[PDB]
Design a protein around this nucleic acid. Structure first.
Lengths: 97, 94, 78, 105, 98, 84, 104, 92
DNA sequence: ATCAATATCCACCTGCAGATTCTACCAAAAGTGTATTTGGAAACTGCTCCATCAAAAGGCATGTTCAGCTGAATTCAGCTGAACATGCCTTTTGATGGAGCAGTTTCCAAATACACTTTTGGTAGAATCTGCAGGTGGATATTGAT
DNA sequence: ATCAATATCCACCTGCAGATTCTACCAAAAGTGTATTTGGAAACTGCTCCATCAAAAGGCATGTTCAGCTGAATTCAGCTGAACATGCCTTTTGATGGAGCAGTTTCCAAATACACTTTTGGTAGAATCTGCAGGTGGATATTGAT
């Protein structure tokens, strides 16, 4: 009965994902979210596939970046586990808040 | 020799309208001129670009309006767009 | 729909971000932040759209929106 | 010989704002409603901040608006703050604000 | 002899300086620092009094804002004393030096 | 004239202490003063650099407040109050 | 006899000119400005292509992809500073794991 | 309609890496790159000239713009290439 | 550190399909040859501002003492979040069509840019005014020791 | 729960350094009468774009276990704040000389405007190819276990 110690697989996923470049958010769910937020600004809009693809690239690169700063904030707190207060601290120093 | 324009004459007028009893130190007026020039540029700028993106050689009140909506936040936007439209339709009413 | 952005997907994002251990409250914290992001961008994009008097948000409308937010993106017309 | 400002019902100089648009290399040509609309927004904005500044002056018992008064009005108004979130007002100081953790336990 | 406990005067100073708007770095020394830096860039440079004035206002506004962020970084580390480490986290997240 | 050296030390511990205060800081470690000087020095270098560049471009020998103001705008630190 | 060949550049001087005129930047445009500008655009382009070229080679690839441009940029101090507020679609991030997070 | 810098990018590619090719997506990025730097340089030169009450953007403006925009070493080389192309253009 | 048994990575090869690269052609640029405009460089020079100096003065910066209480170690155990084997379903994806609509065209009436000629609205100082910066002092907390 | 010890207000005062006005031109709006466009307003396509369908496949939602990480509770060496004694050097005032901004003219080398003449780059098919995605087979990295 083989089992990996907590953390081992996690590092393995970091090494994997920092190596690839494919979008990590499932496409359909995403487009659904994009069109919904948008519905609140102008009704019955249509989206170039390229536009949905630009929005996804942008947000995924944004979130990934934000996680980097969050990780740094957690580490700064002698922790290894990111938390909302870490995301909150980064977004504050970033001026987004 | 070397006449240099400013917005002070206008800032001061508007001041008297809102607070008839209040004055403003020159340094504060200095701040006000910077504000007016800064916002004027940001609007003009975004407008300049909006026009470009649409192969349009002219900046109309329509550009200025969408530029104000991109530049200004929520309530400030609603109110500025109202004042702006009101002025234009009044100006064009001859 | 925002819940459509799943835990494992957020897991993946954090991983590419170098994150090893994730707190259970990060997921909902992430969606809120992702939503504020799209709202600001999309809102700007749709403003460029309506200005161009169109019913279709184009990749260029998104690229110009991202540039205004200081999130310049290369690869989609600029 | 009316002034375009008066035609628009404004204090801010419409003609001057129309001149500054043409000389700024913003576009080949400039519409007649653009300078009007823009002088209107400019006037509205300086009105909004002078209102709040004036009140700050009143609270600090002064009759003449100084820079600290402008800072108080900007930093305390969520929207003006966002609007000028990357601007620094000379001689305006900061807002009285002490993190709780720091107060006598 | 009467004695305020450590931290009381510190808090007294924050209230005081957050209430005021005067420059906090001495004029002459700062003018001397600018001229030194300016010089190591291009010689025979002259300065408008207002230019040095604009430089100081900007510098102090920048340092004051950096310390706020720094302060938040210390707190977040469950400390009350700011450290170079905090200033560095601050500037890194600020994208001033990833 | 007179040689200019070590002027960064003119940014005294008490002045840095006062700035932390306005910034709301209560306790300061001993190493903060040398870090701040380092950070301020980099701040000034970049602003003066761009500023002096604007000066040279206008073929002047005198750095004007407008130069500093344009340099600050470039650097994303817009300053109101000297716009002139 | 085109201006680009005359200035000895691969980049379209004549177009850089037409663009400067039509971009609403100034009333008039010098004749060497478009030349100068065209030279700068080409140089930076070569720089990235060069580094991205290597990044590709160092990966056993002949054809340059977005990943390779991202590796070229982020791994270069200056190019990275110049584009530190830019995001290359499909480029990913540089592998990097905080020491503290490593095993044992 | 719909011009781009592809041809030029590709030509520059063959000079530094004759062997090397380049995907469409990667080409789109070089395009974005060129447009961006073009607008920043252009933009700065515009302001420079305005600050000095000039109505014309000359290589003088473009150069200072390069100095204000490109970082250290990259700025040096850009200035080199620039003056070199202008120098060769004026001659012949 | 080894022993052993998982599972992971990691080359080397290999075969196809989606892209790339390579060709064969047309309008919209880009290059020319002329004919003028003119921006702003060169050559004074009027004259603000900047660099220095001198000097007296007290606001602060320096250094030193001391010890309060904060940051850095440690121990420890509850319980949060990682690793997994499971079972199921939403995302893929791939035509298929129909169609809502960016994109063009063809006018032109409304709106702009022009080139002058008058008419003021503003800006640069004198001429007048006056908040409020400092100065003082009791009235009020605010602290910190018993 | 008291108090001394000090710090913090708040109101009252008063001449002046810093606004408010009061005057005068004149740079720059505004009024007119032409010479260009500009960019909508209908009419029409070729598209990209939703919408279904319709399977199938991963990829995710779930419930178990428990490893090990986050936080709480204690300690305590010594860093950093509070106070003080000293006396330096930044501030403040004023004055000078003259460097070097800025205002004016004077006017060519260079830029804008056509009117054409050629050439190149953007398109829409044609002729290969770089790798992706699998397949072993083989050392590796892990983690339980003498």
């Amino acid at each position: 009965p083989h089992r990996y110690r907590p953390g081992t697989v996690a590092l393995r996923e970091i090494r994997r994902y920092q190596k690839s470049t494919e979008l990590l958010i499932r496409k359909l769910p995403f487009q659904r979210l994009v069109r919904e937020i948008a519905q609140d600004f102008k009704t019955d809009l249509r989206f170039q596939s390229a536009a949905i693809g630009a929005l996804q690239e942008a947000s995924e690169a944004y979130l990934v970046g934000l996680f980097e700063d969050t990780n740094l904030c957690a580490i700064h707190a002698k922790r290894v586990t990111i938390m909302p207060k870490d995301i909150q601290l980064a977004r504050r120093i970033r001026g987004e808040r | 020799r070397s006449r240099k324009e400013s917005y002070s004459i206008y800032v001061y007028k508007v001041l008297k309208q809102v607070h008839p009893d209040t004055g403003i130190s020159s340094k504060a007026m200095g701040i006000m001129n910077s504000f007016v020039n800064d916002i004027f540029e940001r609007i003009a700028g975004e407008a300049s670009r909006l026009a470009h993106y649409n192969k349009r050689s002219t900046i109309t009140s329509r550009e200025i309006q969408t530029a104000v909506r991109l530049l200004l936040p929520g309530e400030l936007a609603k109110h500025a767009v109202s004042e702006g439209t009101k002025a234009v339709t009044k100006y064009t009413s001859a | 729909n925002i819940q459509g952005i799943t835990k494992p997907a957020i897991r993946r994002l954090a991983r590419r971000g170098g994150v090893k251990r994730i707190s259970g409250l990060i997921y909902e914290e992430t969606r809120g932040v992702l939503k504020v992001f799209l709202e600001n961008v999309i809102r700007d994009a749709v403003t460029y759209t309506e200005h161009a008097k169109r019913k279709t948000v184009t990749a260029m409308d998104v690229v110009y929106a991202l540039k205004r937010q200081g999130r310049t993106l290369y690869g989609f017309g600029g | 010989a009316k002034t375009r400002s008066s035609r628009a019902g404004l204090q801010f100089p419409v003609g001057r704002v129309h001149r500054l648009l043409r000389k700024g290399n913003y576009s080949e040509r400039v519409g007649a409603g653009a300078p009007v609309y823009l002088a209107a927004v400019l006037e509205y904005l300086t009105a909004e901040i002078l209102e709040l500044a004036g009140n700050a002056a009143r609270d600090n018992k002064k009759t003449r608006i100084i820079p600290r008064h402008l800072q108080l009005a900007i930093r305390n108004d969520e929207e003006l703050n966002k609007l000028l979130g990357r601007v620094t007002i000379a001689q305006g100081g900061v807002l009285p604000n002490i993190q709780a953790v720091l107060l006598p336990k």
